Design a protein around this ligand. Structure first.
Ligand code: TRP
Ligand code: MG
Ligand code: MG
Ligand code: MG
Ligand code: MG
Ligand code: MG
Ligand code: MG
Ligand code: MG
Ligand code: MG
Ligand code: MG
Ligand code: MG
Ligand code: MG
Ligand code: MG
Ligand code: MG
Ligand code: MG
Ligand code: MG
Ligand code: MG
Ligand code: MG
Ligand code: MG
Ligand code: MG
Ligand code: MG
Ligand code: MG
Ligand code: MG
Ligand code: MG
Ligand code: MG
Ligand code: MG
Ligand code: MG
Ligand code: MG
Ligand code: MG
Ligand code: MG
Ligand code: MG
Ligand code: MG
Ligand code: MG
Ligand code: MG
Ligand code: MG
Ligand code: MG
Ligand code: MG
Ligand code: MG
Ligand code: MG
Ligand code: MG
Ligand code: MG
Ligand code: MG
Ligand code: MG
Ligand code: MG
Ligand code: MG
Ligand code: MG
Lengths: 271, 46, 17
RNA sequence: UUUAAUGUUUGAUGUUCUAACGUUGACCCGUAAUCCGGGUUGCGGACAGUGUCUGGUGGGUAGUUUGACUGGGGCGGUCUC
RNA sequence: UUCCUUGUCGGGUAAGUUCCGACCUGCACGAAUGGCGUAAUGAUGGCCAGGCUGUCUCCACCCGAGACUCAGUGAAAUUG
RNA sequence: CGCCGGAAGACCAAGGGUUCCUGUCCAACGUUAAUCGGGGCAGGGUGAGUCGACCCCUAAGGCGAGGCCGAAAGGCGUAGUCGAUGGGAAACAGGUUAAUAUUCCUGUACUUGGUGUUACUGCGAAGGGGGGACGGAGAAGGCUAUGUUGGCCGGGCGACGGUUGUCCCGGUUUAAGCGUGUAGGCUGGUUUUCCAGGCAAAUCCGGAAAAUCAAGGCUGAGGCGUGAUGACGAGGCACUACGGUGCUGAAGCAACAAAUGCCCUGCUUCCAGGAAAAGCCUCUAAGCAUCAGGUAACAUCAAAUCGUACCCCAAACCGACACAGGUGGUCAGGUAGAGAAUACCAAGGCGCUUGAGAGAACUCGGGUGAAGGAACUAGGCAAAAUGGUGCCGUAACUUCGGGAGAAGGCACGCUGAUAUGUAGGUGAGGUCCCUCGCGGAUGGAGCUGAAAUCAGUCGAAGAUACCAGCUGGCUGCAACUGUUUAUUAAAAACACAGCACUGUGCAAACACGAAAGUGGACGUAUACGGUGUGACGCCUGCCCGGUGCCGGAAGGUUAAUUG
RNA sequence: GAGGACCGAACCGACUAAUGUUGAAAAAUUAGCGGAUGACUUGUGGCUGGGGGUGAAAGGCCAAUCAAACCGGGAGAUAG
């Protein structure tokens, strides 16, 4: 449910917020939280190495299980929760042995559903199998690229991966970008898509709403002086040059992938 | 209005104190120069 | 000390450009 | 001038392999440790990466240059015979 | 954004180089170095009206602090 | 006599360091004199088991054995060890010095350790679990600090008309601790069996099942009792170096109103989803097993060291000055008021370290102004005006919220009646009930108390002072709240939500780094970087020759290398 | 009982005028003025270092200094 706010204020006129009534109204599970302090985009030299990062709301890190290696033991979904550190929601699951873990909540999951991990699990959303056991053409998410390392592909809200082909020791996947990729068939994947697909319909509505997320303002390069940016300078609004980054590399078109040790795994680049 | 010198004895010692000079090679060269000159007070201390 | 304020001001100084 | 046959490698391209090399995969130990090192294993694999030499690109950065005459300078004209 | 230019026509004024509406002959507008609109907002730019007034016609008087005299202390720029 | 009184009073942190108090001096300092002083000289003054530091514990961050990396110097970082601005045991009232007090004295308390005796007994961590332990806003309800009036007690009977009364003034204060367990808030309880979990074990935590009981538990301000037959106390009396000292001592209650303080780290709600570690409680492992250890009572000893004066919105700190400047926290009385605004006051503290005259021009800060009313000027600059509350009424346009406090208008004091003070709030006694109390019901004394209507009345004026919007019409620019040239520019500039192009498949692109490494990000294409445009509405046309980027690979040209 | 909502003190700012300009002050005072639950404000501590930082971008700020800080040295640079 996306709801448009009424324009009682000029800062409310264009706000669209996403309200999920099934999120837990309460505190998170304390044993699985951690400290997570902010950086400001600064590295261990103390220097801004990424721009436009700063401030925001205080957050605590939820230890999410991306490996899903509690094999054979069935677990039941206890509740769905908000996570400030990712766009998707997280589900608290309880194992039959009495252990509790967080997972990425797939689409259609509710409290009380049963999920299982391991090679013998059934083909239902939320279940994790090695990709040699998943039929070709299935929609999966939270895909591993190295066996035993944890899921790394298709983790944001609404995303999924398509298993296109299987040829011996590799499966061909259609990534969410449109890229075709090969990974080992022994890596794991979870059935279904990542929930919270209405994430992208939200509208922040005001400048201060982006400051609550840690995003500081962007100054256009053309508004600076020549000493600051390659685009700086002018009497009035003058450009007359090819657009570039602040460090003089051409933007708008120039390809920057240079990785020859992984070219073998990429069947086709995105179009 | 508000001026530049805003005293604080903790920040005075952590910045220019004896043990802060002794923590680096260049700080120990400052103390070498001030002994060679004959300064009555080497650092900003007690 | 610094210069007198009227000797710094452009309006007073720059009367014949 | 043109060949073909045997033997031989001279390269080049491809296909395999593993033993150099990589691992910001897993596990075990030093160990009270998400560093590091050692060990077992999986995956890549003579590729990647790094050194010397080399062509291209390179205001990202650096050092500098951008004449004189002239009824003020510039613009124009001139500068030798 | 229009040099010629106070273009021309209309409105407002007794009288309007400004302002508003139009015309188009755009020296030298124009479509994300965005075009054209736009309710609300602005210690934002221009113009008009009502109220109000010493802004003015054209100033007069009054209350205080200096200026002036007395006692004490006591500078400065400058200067053949 | 005048001024401050949400300070110009009181207490601190930071900072300073003897400025503090007493005697003494007036050469220099003090914008004048000085017998005075934050000045000179000499002497004195800072008392802690409980306040703060130190200490135990950690955040951001620092340093970092080994380690990885680097011409050298060095850089990063693991184990660790430091680092508060945060978490961790405990004291209150009264009295006293010229100067210190939660430190000294009186009274009454509390905390944590060690040692020993007695009684009983499974103790044990560098490990497991709990707890510590956490957001914004909002809404009330229960209270107290505090204040007002009455009652009570002591004094008074008035410089000028009146003043034995429904009159005037003053006081009416008491802590921590200990005992009780209330308005509230959270939670079902108890037993038994079993178990792929919590690195191993666990009786602890988590999970499963059955049985049974309907209550139990945790937390909690205030009040009440004691502390306290005490202390304090308006005054009175006795002396005095005239500063003070000594002695004695009444009443010490109730009602009402009420916080921004406490219950409350609570409750409701929202999305932007809101520290860590120890002290603490518990479980055990190795281990020890008549031991050690643990628990409880009693005795006993210990609680070290450092700070403590004074100023702290300032003449003591930062500004060269005894400088219209700057400086974090706590306290928070009355009358009017919505109020911490504003006016007058209390407690308290001050009158700003040159004065005396005169009453010219001119300058500064204000008051009033005949008739006119923007004619002034670059321009209504500056002034003047408007200004509250309640009710009536209010256009175009609109993104349907606005515009809007549009515009405009009416009422407003005091007195009496309704009503010897109403509607409302609080709520005693009494009676009834039971669970016998910090309870419920009934009841209405007493206290408090608007708003209105009617009638009258005074003035030129009733929002009387202070305080407290000028309004409307047309149009350019930027949507809007914000940000900016500290010290001549606050804007139409920057930002912005939204839009689009583009790079990036994760050891990501990209950025800081001779490197190791770090950020991006404990993120994963609904993500991240760069670039332009800049809410919304209607839209965004043609050109690929030039320059750039993207793709191609035939052919031409083409480096080191070979020779 | 929402809100980068409204009016308005503390608090943060700095739009206009007058004064001052050897000032009371090397940027203030008086009278008005803007925001005032947020992209707010503030105390304490910490980190970024000079062709470098940081910058809601003014060539702004980096100790009254900034189109390249300050201190010491090359150094008695050079100066038709
Ligand atoms: N004139 C003013 C402001 C000012 C200070 N410094 C200046 C220098 C130049 C011009 C003006 C100033 C004064 O003296 O206080
Ligand atoms: Mg960015
Ligand atoms: Mg943007
Ligand atoms: Mg600019
Ligand atoms: Mg450049
Ligand atoms: Mg131009
Ligand atoms: Mg150059
Ligand atoms: Mg040179
Ligand atoms: Mg010349
Ligand atoms: Mg026109
Ligand atoms: Mg244009
Ligand atoms: Mg153009
Ligand atoms: Mg176009
Ligand atoms: Mg264009
Ligand atoms: Mg004289
Ligand atoms: Mg007064
Ligand atoms: Mg002295
Ligand atoms: Mg004194
Ligand atoms: Mg004197
Ligand atoms: Mg003295
Ligand atoms: Mg420590
Ligand atoms: Mg004292
Ligand atoms: Mg009489
Ligand atoms: Mg003085
Ligand atoms: Mg002062
Ligand atoms: Mg202040
Ligand atoms: Mg006041
Ligand atoms: Mg006079
Ligand atoms: Mg008149
Ligand atoms: Mg008149
Ligand atoms: Mg005129
Ligand atoms: Mg004005
Ligand atoms: Mg115009
Ligand atoms: Mg604004
Ligand atoms: Mg300025
Ligand atoms: Mg200004
Ligand atoms: Mg723009
Ligand atoms: Mg090409
Ligand atoms: Mg607001
Ligand atoms: Mg500012
Ligand atoms: Mg002011
Ligand atoms: Mg306001
Ligand atoms: Mg410029
Ligand atoms: Mg400066
Ligand atoms: Mg030399
Ligand atoms: Mg020289």
């Amino acid at each position: 449910a996306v709801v448009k706010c009424k324009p009682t204020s000029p800062g409310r006129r264009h706000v669209v917020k996403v309200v999920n009534p099934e999120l837990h109204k309460g505190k998170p599970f304390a044993p699985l939280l951690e400290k997570n302090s902010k950086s400001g985009g600064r590295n261990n030299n103390g220097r801004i190495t990424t721009r436009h990062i700063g401030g925001g709301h205080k957050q605590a890190y939820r230890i999410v299980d991306f490996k899903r290696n509690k094999d054979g033991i069935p677990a039941v979904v206890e509740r769905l929760e908000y996570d400030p550190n990712r766009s998707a929601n997280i589900a608290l699951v309880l194992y039959k042995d009495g252990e509790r873990r967080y997972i990425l909540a797939p689409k259609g999951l509710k409290a009380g559903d049963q999920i299982q991990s391991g090679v013998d699990a059934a083909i239902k959303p939320g279940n994790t199998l090695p990709m040699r056991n998943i039929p070709v053409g299935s929609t999966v998410h939270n895909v591993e690229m190295k066996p035993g390392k944890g899921g790394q592909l298709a983790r944001s809200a609404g995303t999924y991966v398509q298993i296109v082909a299987r040829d011996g020791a590799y499966v061909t996947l259609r990534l969410r970008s449109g890229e075709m990729r090969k990974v080992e068939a022994d890596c794991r994947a979870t059935l279904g898509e990542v929930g919270n697909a209405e994430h992208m319909l939200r509208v922040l509505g005001k400048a201060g709403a982006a400051r609550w997320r840690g995003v500081r303002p962007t100054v256009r390069g053309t508004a600076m002086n020549p000493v600051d940016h390659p685009h700086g300078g002018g009497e009035g609004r003058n450009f007359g040059k090819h657009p570039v980054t602040p460090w003089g590399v051409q933007t708008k078109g120039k390809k920057t992938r240079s990785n020859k040790r992984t070219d073998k795994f990429i069947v086709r680049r995105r179009s | 209005m508000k001026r530049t010198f805003q005293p604080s004895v903790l920040k005075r010692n952590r910045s220019h104190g004896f043990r802060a000079r002794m923590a680096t090679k260049n700080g120990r060269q400052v103390l070498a120069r001030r002994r060679a000159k004959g300064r009555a007070r080497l650092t900003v201390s007690k | 000390v610094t210069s007198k304020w009227f000797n710094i001001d452009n309006k007073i100084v720059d009367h014949r450009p």
